[PDB]
Subunit: 29 residues, 4 copies
Amino acid sequence: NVLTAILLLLRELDAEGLEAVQQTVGSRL
Amino acid sequence: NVLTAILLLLRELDAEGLEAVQQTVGSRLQA
Amino acid sequence: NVLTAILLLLRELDAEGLEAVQQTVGSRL
Amino acid sequence: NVLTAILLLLRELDAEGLEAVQQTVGSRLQA
Ligand SMILES: [Cl-]
Ligand SMILES: [Cl-]
Ligand SMILES: [Cl-]
Ligand SMILES: [Cl-]
């Protein structure tokens, strides 16, 4: 359920927030 | 706010979920 | 982490969304 | 949207988390 919630929430973000997410995700992978 | 919630939820994801977020965000950023 | 995220997200909601949350939570308790 | 995400996340909470959401929403609704 957490993945679905995150993906739904991503479209409240603009470019700067998406870059923050991408950097956190990359550091975790 | 929404960003802070997302970053906290990322700590709960497994590898496959992280890869799906990576692919989705990359598609949003590149277009 | 899920509780904190939910509580943070609640202030994006107005009265109608809060009532939806309260009804779902009550049915779960 | 945010509402749909919240309702999905509620399925992941334990009893104590549900009670904390109940108390927070009730305080927001009553004021
Ligand atoms: Cl998940
Ligand atoms: Cl999106
Ligand atoms: Cl939690
Ligand atoms: Cl609130």
